[model samples]
Each structure stands twice: as C-alpha cells, then as structure tokens.
Target: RGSHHHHHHGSAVQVTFTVQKGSDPKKLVLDIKYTRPGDSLAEVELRQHGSEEWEPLTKKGNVWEVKSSKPLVGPFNFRFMSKGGMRNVFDEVIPTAFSIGKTYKPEE
Candidate 1:
C-alpha cells in the first residue's frame, strides 16, 4: 500500500527547427523581397527537387513570388538573383518545404 500511479522519468521529448525557406511539404508560397535602390532589378529562380531547370519567379512590384498550384510532396528549391547595371546580388538555392493549408514566413 505505498504506490499509486508512477510516471516515467525523461520519457517525454520535444524538438523544434527553424523554417528555413517556405511554409509548413504540401502547399507553399515563396515571397522574396529585396531592397530596390535606384534602377536595380531583382529576380527569383525556382525549381522542384530532382528537376534540371530553374524558372523565373513571377514579379509583382517589389516582391518576387511563386505558388504551388498542386500540393507538393517534398522540398521546393529556389534562388534569388538580382542584377542591375554594375550591381549584382544573389542568394543561392535555399531548400524549403510546406504543409497544406498552413502559412509560413519567407526566409531572409
């Protein structure tokens, strides 16, 4: 008569990771923003995993973005390449994934 319910020690766990690129592996909207000074131009290049080509992202004002029409199963890779006159700035492919019906912030 000395015991009730026993709880296990160190049996619970939790893990967390930073969303590097896109939203939560199914649905994603990658919005890339950059500083536009003077006549500088910015562009975003994107392609799915196992693909051999990178396509240009649709440009809307100061933001370049791409949306997944159909739910994707894995990571979607993209790059931000900007150039104007003698200025060239870019960010290489940052692997990203997203979940259906969820929203996430774009990577810096």
Candidate 2:
C-alpha cells in the first residue's frame, strides 16, 4: 500500500484536518490540527498519496497543515505519532468518501 501506519501510547491525542475540495477535481488542501499531550512537535507525520514516506506537518495551536498535491478520489486517512506507541490518533484509516458540495459552507 502507499501509506504508513502508526500506533499510540500514553493518552489519546486529537487531530483535526481541513480538507478542501479542489476545482481541478483531483486536488485538495489538507489543513490539519493536532494536540500532543506528552510529546515533542517532531513525532507527527502526514502521509501523502501513492507514497510511503510521510512528511511532517507542523503543529500550530493544535493543528497541522498538510496540502494534497493531488485530489483524493475517496476517503483519506493519516496518522499522528505520539510517544510510547500512540501513533495516528485520527479516525478512519480506511479510505473514506467526501462529497463535493455545490456551494462552500463558508460561502453560504
């Protein structure tokens, strides 16, 4: 597969992502947010599509910003690595689906 998997230890961490659908139909702006209760800012990663190597998405105010160079056709999932064995506190490692709405929620 073209993804990396991680487990977690200590307490469970929380990560939120802002995945915006692109107009090109195959691109997305993956903005992320996360909180590490007991780890440094260097343990997290954002896995990209069709690649096993994960790039680090910096954390600012409990969020990490990861941009997708290509649009994700189906549901996407990534992980956040914490101390111990706690990696990827995010939900749905399996590919999930997202609907491209007619209008942006913020635009309404």
Candidate 3:
C-alpha cells in the first residue's frame, strides 16, 4: 500500500473532505472544508488511490466539491491535493455503507 502519511510543522491547515453519492448511482459527489491559517486555497484535487489520474475539485461557496465521471468499484481509496501541493497525505478509503449515495461528514 502506497498510503504513507506526510507530516509538516509550522504552517499546517486542518482541511476535511466529505464524500457523498450523486443522483446517479455511478456518480460520486465530494465536498471539502478547512480551517485556514491565513494562506489562500487555490483549489482542491483528487485521484483514485493508487491511480495516477488526478481530478480537480471545484469550490461551492465555502465548500469544495467534485463529482466522479465514471462508475466506482468497491473498497475505493483516493488521494487529495491542494493547489499544487498538500500538507498531509489525504489518501482515503471508502466504506461499503457509502457505496450508493450515502453521505459522511468532515472530521477535520
């Protein structure tokens, strides 16, 4: 597993992401919110865990949102980035309960 974590000090931000199902069963909806430490967020992006293709997340008001283009498989994992870089490794795994269109809250 390439799920190693990154640790940084001094200028760290507490950003959290949420995953939800879209209207379509094959679609995925994601949202992000953060505790800013004065640095301006350029944008948020994500990629399927262990995959190289990265998808960008768009900002909706204070929350960053993104939707999947293709259908997903079970036991999903994803990596996240902010601007061109990120403070921590945000690679996440999806649960079976979140398979269809279920929603989860941010814990950051």
- Top of the candidates by lDDT: 3
On a 0 to 1 TM-score scale, where does candidate 1 land against the true structure?
0.42
Better of 2 and 3 by lDDT: 3
For model 3 the TM-score comes to 0.54
Task: Pick the winner on TM-score between candidates 1 and 2.
Answer: 2
TM-score of 2: 0.42
TM-score-based ranking: 3, 2, 1
Tens-place lDDT per residue, model 1, 5-107, is 5453422212111232445344344444344434334455666666655556677543455555544433555554446533332222344434333333334
Q: Write the per-residue lDDT of candidate 3 for residues 24-68, one digit (tens) a residue.
A: 445456555555565545655656544567666566665545466
TM-score winner, 2 or 3: 3
| Model 3, residue 102: C-alpha shift (Å) | 8.9
Predicted structure 1: lDDT: 0.44
lDDT of 2 by residue, 34-98 (tens): 55666533455655445665556555454445545565433344655655565543434424354
Estimate candidate 3's RMSD in Å: 8.7
Worst 10 residues of 3 by lDDT: 99-108
Candidate-wise lDDT, in order: 0.44, 0.47, 0.51
Per-residue error for 53 in candidate 3, Å, reads 0.2
